[PDB]
Paper text:
To determine the molecular basis of the specific interaction with PPARα/γ, we solved the crystal structure of sanguinarine complexed with PPARα and SRC1-2 LXXLL motif. The structure revealed that the PPARα–LBD–sanguinarine complex was folded into a three-layer helical sandwich, with the C-terminal AF-2 helix positioned in a canonical active conformation, in agreement with the agonistic nature of the PPARα ligand. The binding of sanguinarine to PPARα was stabilized by a combination of hydrogen bonds, including Cys275 from helix 3, Arg271 from helix 3, Tyr334 from the loop between the β sheet, and hydrophobic interactions, such as Ala333 and Val255. Surprisingly, compared with known PPARα Y-shaped ligand-binding pockets and ligand-binding sites, sanguinarine has a unique ligand-binding site in a novel PPARα ligand-binding pocket, which may represent a new pharmacophore that can be optimized to selectively target PPARα. The R271L and C275A mutations decrease the activation of PPARα by sanguinarine, but not the PPARα-selective ligand GW735 in cell-based reporter assays using a GAL4-driven PPARα response reporter. As such, the Y334F mutation decreases the activation of PPARα by sanguinarine, but not GW735. In addition, the A333G and V255T mutations both decrease the activation of PPARα by sanguinarine, but not PPARα-selective ligand GW735 in cell-based assays, which emphasizes the importance of these hydrophobic interactions for sanguinarine binding to PPARα. The conformational changes in sanguinarine binding with PPARα can be further clarified by the superposition of the sanguinarine–PPARα structure with the GW735–PPARα structure, which revealed that helix 2, helix 3 and the loop between H2 and H3, shifted outward significantly, thereby increasing the affinity of PPARα with sanguinarine. Compared with the GW735–PPARα, the AF2 and helix 3 of the sanguinarine–PPARα shifted outward, which causes SRC1 to shift inward, closer to PPARα.
Residue numbers in the entry:
A (entry chain B): 688 to 695
B (entry chain A): 200 to 257, 263 to 468
Write the structure that this text describes.
Amino acid sequence: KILHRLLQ
Amino acid sequence: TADLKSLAKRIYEAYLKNFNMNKVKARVILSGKASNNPPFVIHDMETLCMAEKTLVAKIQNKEAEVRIFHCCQCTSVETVTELTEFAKAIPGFANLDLNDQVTLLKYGVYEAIFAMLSSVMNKDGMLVAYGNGFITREFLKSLRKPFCDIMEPKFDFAMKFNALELDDSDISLFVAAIICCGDRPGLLNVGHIEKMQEGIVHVLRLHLQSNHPDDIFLFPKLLQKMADLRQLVTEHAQLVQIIKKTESDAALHPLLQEIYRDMY
Ligand SMILES: C[n+]1cc2c3c(ccc2c2ccc4cc5c(cc4c21)OCO5)OCO3
């Protein structure tokens, strides 16, 4: 989820 | 186009745009022509304390090792962020599923970090704090275990990796190949990532022929370094576990927690 977020 | 000319160029430019450190800059700081005053040598606790005093000035009840360990983590979180932007600039990567993107980075980033670490390491030690510090190889070996065992494998790897005498263009394509790997566990759209990797490796082969005409066996040497990295990571993941379990004031950063979960 923090990794989802960086790919924003 | 699909043209490998524009693939190499776009990857080299995404590499220069997105990484604070690289080999050219590293070589310039280590010759002493980057600043009026060269990097601060950290070789004992005396100098480590001067260095922390001036470059951070907030953690003096927490043990030296625990603070150095905090710093390793801060640097990974930064480089993971640079790598995600770098990834996003690789032709084709933007067009992948979000879940495939997460996977490729989850397994990609530590291989990439150790590959790029090599650029800031010589036989004597490594640049830290955005090029402002030089922590000695020996000072790191002379920490209490298990912390003195982190970097030593990375120096071993980097010493041989650096002997290949690659430049930043060669390294840009090499990081791109690490990230776009079709056999990561969990990958959904394997066939499209395999085709993407086939292209990068291909332009990498072509790039090495023209850029390194002397070393005819350089391409197979680099493919082997990618296997070697995959195994440097597993051993490091294992060593970071020992530390999570057997060390109180060393709670891993939450981003690195996700990355290490279910890993190997
Ligand atoms: C732990 N760190 C992280 C850093 C960092 C930076 C830039 C500089 C630093 C830094 C500079 C001096 C330090 C000195 C220290 C230390 C840690 C640091 C330190 O622990 C003990 O003495 O960008 C991302 O993360």
